[PDB]
Amino acid sequence: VMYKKILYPTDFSETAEIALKHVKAFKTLKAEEVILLHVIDEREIKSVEEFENELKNKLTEEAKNKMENIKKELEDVGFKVKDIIVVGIPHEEIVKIAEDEGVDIIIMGSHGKTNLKEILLGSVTENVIKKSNKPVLVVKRKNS
Amino acid sequence: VMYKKILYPTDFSETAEIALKHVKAFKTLKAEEVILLHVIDEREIKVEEFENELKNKLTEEAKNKMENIKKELEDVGFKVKDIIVVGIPHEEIVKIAEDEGVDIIIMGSHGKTNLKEILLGSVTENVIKKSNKPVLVVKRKNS
């Protein structure tokens, strides 16, 4: 085991920002890489086709400024960063991209933009742990 | 975030053994500590002399397995605090992670049951949902 390549999927939520702290903690003196991923949920997005395309382009643009600030923070600590924005089902794309990129670990929050108090584990994290064969570091949301 | 103190709860399963490689990968140049914990599940003990006999055999078997893990961890330079308790595994792991002030819990996705159809063991599901500590879930073999 060596944690050379990390997958860090973010939905720009407060809990995902806690998980960024842990991505930064994995830095050593060796060379390391972060796959920085945001998924635009296609289910939410749902001529007709023309309208869909234009809408998908708008969500993308609106996620680029957030991704650039994170990419710069991570580059400043010494990582190489591959940033990806993709339209699709979030838990499926995280699992697919962790396998395609050959990562050593996925570091993610326990909760995300919904963060309902009664829910004790978000559905993207629960599906990624159950469906991926990669190690998953689950960083918990703030206390109360 | 600094991973100075790790809680490594083991049931001595094959998936827990995979998780032990990840505990060793957390070693750096700095002083690190592992809380090595084994819970004897009280629900599998619950005639009274039969219980004590079973209890003793489980404690004896746990101490023998824990001694070898402890040395393997000390050999890579950890300080190890080894703990054996009788109780409910997920509850004891949540409680001892808090009481020891660990930085992270490193554990398997599955354990001694390891049923193919089950995609996350109930100990790990409970610890993720009840603990506020970061949890590194190490998955079972793909075989």
Ligand SMILES: Nc1ncnc2c1ncn2[C@@H]1O[C@H](COP(=O)(O)OP(=O)(O)OP(=O)(O)O)[C@@H](O)[C@H]1O
């Ligand atoms: N669209 C996404 N793109 C990338 N990562 C995401 C996305 N959505 C969630 N995540 C990741 O999953 C973690 C857990 O958030 P999750 O979405 O499961 O929780 P939630 O929003 O509280 O619950 P739910 O979506 O089930 O209502 C996040 O901290 C983030 O790391």
Ligand SMILES: Nc1ncnc2c1ncn2[C@@H]1O[C@H](COP(=O)(O)OP(=O)(O)OP(=O)(O)O)[C@@H](O)[C@H]1O
């Ligand atoms: N009694 C225990 N003591 C310490 N750690 C344990 C104990 N039982 C399980 N664990 C931890 O939990 C991880 C996940 O095992 P878990 O018990 O949840 O899976 P399982 O045995 O396949 O399923 P289940 O117990 O629900 O039948 C193990 O790899 C280990 O790290």
Ligand SMILES: [Mn+2]
């Ligand atoms: Mn969500």
Ligand SMILES: [Mn+2]
């Ligand atoms: Mn078990």
